[PDB]
Amino acid sequence: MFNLNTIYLSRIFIEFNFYFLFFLFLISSIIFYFSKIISIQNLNQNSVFNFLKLANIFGILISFFIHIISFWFYCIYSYNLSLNIFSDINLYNSNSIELLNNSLLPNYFKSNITIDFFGLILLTLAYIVGFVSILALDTRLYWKNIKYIFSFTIFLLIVYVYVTVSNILLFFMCYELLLIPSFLIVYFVSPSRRAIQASLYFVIWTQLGSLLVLIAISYIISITNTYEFNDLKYFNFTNSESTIIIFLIFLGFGFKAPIWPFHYWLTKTHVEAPSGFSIYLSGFLVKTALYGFYKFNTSIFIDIDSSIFIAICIMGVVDSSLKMWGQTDLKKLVAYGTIQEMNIIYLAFCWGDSCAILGGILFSATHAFLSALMFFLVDCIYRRYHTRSLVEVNGILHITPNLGLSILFMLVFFSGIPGTIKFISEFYIFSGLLEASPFICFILMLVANVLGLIGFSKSWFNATFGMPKKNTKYLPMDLSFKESYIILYCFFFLFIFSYFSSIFF
């Protein structure tokens, strides 16, 4: 019963959501630039900053709704396309349907849009995490950094082009574009003074991997003049070229997606970055690297043993889990948890295009939401109690019961209880790893889910429980409606996304 109307509606929605976002950004920027001689906030109720905040927030939200609709359309379209290809067996018949482009808006960068489930999951993560982070950075943007209110819209545009393009060069350029806005945010919006050095560490560490990926892309393009991302099927790389490409790609993308030993920059940036921008960083900016690695390694044929890469990922997991215990700083502890989860996700992609990709994608989604939750809780703790250290913070529950309850339920979700996408992803990864190498699976599970879990839970329990006798005049009240609903939405997604259609998982 599938008809061409659904196909064209899916394509039109995907193409036009990008232009909706672009036009909203363009209009907001034009207003901001042409309303004032100097693009800074006027400290009065009639400032354009209120309008810009409104436009950004409710452009992101409306585009997120449209993205939900377009993602559902894509799911239907892809399922029916697979059915059309598979069902017909007559030799004379073949599925050759050609679609003609619309005459209303042009194809950005003269590229035909191609959409995949992983790309749309990444885009949805971008939308949600950007919404959370923009909601967080309101107290940080003040009177000289208001120009960074459009940073998340720029991120959304970049990610949209990144995930809706079938061109290797455009893919790489979109991947590389993410550095400037993030660095500017960390440099100009971070309150702490150590953020100045944290930004430089972030830039250098990420740019080393960017250079590695650039070398890999140069190898691919120079050897194969193609750029369509699909002509690589008709060209085979020799053993030496293939091993060089895979090594460069893995190391370069692991520089971004933290892997052992390249997580010093991640720890520094998470500790010294804005509480609202750390959410976006951990949730999304480390998964574009995973998506790029998946695309490139599945496009290229590799005839090398992945034991070294698996060992690197497992070593990173073990290192982070062991170090979890010794962190009295909640933000650094959450950063180590992010390192652990990212390393597990990366390990999920070490078997080419096998079924591990499904578990990797689900774990990426659950890790995004869980890291957003944890960093938001740390942000609330730091903002209401003027410290994020365990020694200075204790007995949160008895003065802010909602915050303590959120901490406890965050710990429960992090533990990986059944009924959560976290548990589902763990089940996928461990079920595969048991047959791949059962002893390695046992070691990984033991470490991560006992030693790292205990180290993680010690600090959070000690902070939540106790008796806050110190500084009674300065104690806070409770979570606000915004924070409470953000936490509730994170929990609701983590719980209900397990009912998503199992066709794609």
């Binding site: 003065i399 019961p401 009240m477 409770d478």
Partner: protein
Amino acid sequence: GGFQKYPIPRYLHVGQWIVNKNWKWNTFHMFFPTAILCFMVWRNSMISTAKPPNYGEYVDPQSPVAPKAIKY
């Protein structure tokens, strides 16, 4: 027996020695709707409930309900 009672701040939403005057109506309006919800859940779930045969019943091997092996 118990600890001596001490004042609790009004602004703080905590359960220390909380007693509600309208607890009777609160219980009435929290019990019955929960019972209706669980009745709905139970009647929905009974559609997928399985029971073994009764005392005087035996399962015919050739009946459709009898287990069937996969046919290649």
